[PDB]
Design a protein around this ligand. Structure first.
Ligand SMILES: [Cl-]
Ligand SMILES: [Cl-]
Ligand code: NA
Ligand code: NA
Ligand code: NA
Ligand SMILES: [Zn+2]
Length: 315
């Protein structure tokens, strides 16, 4: 009966000694098993595996606690989805473009590239240690684990089409936004005024206009009575805001925004690019970079800096 020693893990930090029988597969001994992303479930131990670390599913109470503390999920398939994505993302390339970690286009990943570029330009801290650790590496240029985690947390597989606004929502759900507050007022000439207070992720996201200045002036929305109501920003406390809308031709003016996402094509199929406002307007499309003094395109999301805002509007 021949054996080697290997280590299992769910978090790649806490290791669990195992003595494995070389006549059985990893799967017969551990359940689904992965070696830096590669599925070894149906493989029998090799001598070269001695001393190496394998990921497994959180198959006992110790691992369940370790996995929840590191990832902040109890979705049973999470670890397998992360590993499956990592086996791909470890082969992607992450060029530094204008000082930021981007992603060379592969596997329909333009939505991930513009999300990653965006994160590097807004003040945001993640809650799960897994995203903390992986995001630090991604800033340094080694973004594979971070991208595989985005995919897993968003329930997206490599190659699946994704929406930037939705992806950001998931990332924000795993971020500490508890200092963010938004007060809105909605005014119907028939139905009167309704103030609402939004906290956390809802305090920093709005769907319906790209213009923060228009959101402060008031945007027209439906009311139940059939009139239009006017929605405006009363008060904002956050380090950024994200304004989104269905893609439409829109002019991005240098110095008036932080960065934006552009979507060319239609709902079936298109492509994202990233625009960042620095000393000029830079358009980052994966590995590609172009510049211009002005920019007009089908924009979907625009990010703005903020600290504290209070309206002058008297009601
Ligand atoms: Cl972080
Ligand atoms: Cl979280
Ligand atoms: Na896979
Ligand atoms: Na950031
Ligand atoms: Na949160
Ligand atoms: Zn009304």
């Amino acid at each position: 009966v021949r054996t080697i020693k290997v280590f299992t893990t769910v978090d790649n930090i806490n290791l669990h000694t195992q003595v494995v029988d070389m006549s059985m597969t990893y799967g017969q001994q551990f359940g689904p098993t992965y070696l830096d992303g590669a599925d070894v479930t149906k493989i029998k131990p090799h001598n070269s595996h001695e001393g190496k670390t394998f990921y497994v599913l959180p198959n006992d109470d110790t691992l369940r606690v370790e996995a929840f503390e590191y990832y902040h999920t109890t979705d049973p398939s999470f670890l397998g989805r992360y590993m499956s994505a990592l086996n791909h993302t470890k082969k992607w390339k992450y060029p530094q473009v204008n000082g930021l970690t981007s992603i060379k286009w592969a596997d329909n990943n333009s939505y991930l590239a513009t999300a990653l570029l965006t994160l590097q330009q807004i003040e945001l801290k993640f809650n799960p240690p897994a995203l903390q650790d992986a995001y630090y590496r991604a800033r340094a240029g080694e973004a594979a684990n971070f991208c595989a985690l985005i995919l897993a947390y968003c329930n997206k597989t490599v190659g699946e089409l994704g929406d930037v606004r939705e992806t950001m929502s998931y990332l924000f759900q795993h971020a500490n936004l508890d200092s963010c507050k938004r007060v809105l007022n909605v005014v119907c000439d028939t139905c009167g005024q309704q103030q609402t207070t939004l906290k956390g992720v809802e305090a920093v996201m709005y769907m319906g206009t790209l213009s923060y200045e228009q959101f402060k002036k008031g945007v027209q929305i439906p009311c139940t009575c059939g009139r239009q109501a006017t929605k405006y920003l009363v008060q904002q406390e956050s380090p950024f805001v994200m304004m989104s809308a269905p893609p439409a031709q829109y002019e991005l003016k240098h110095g008036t925004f932080t960065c934006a996402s552009e979507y060319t094509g239609n709902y079936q199929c298109g492509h994202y690019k990233h625009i960042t406002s620095k000393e000029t307007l830079y358009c980052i499309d994966g590995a590609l970079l172009t510049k211009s003094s002005e920019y007009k395109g089908p924009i979907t999301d625009v990010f703005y800096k903020e600290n504290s805002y209070t309206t002058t509007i008297k009601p």
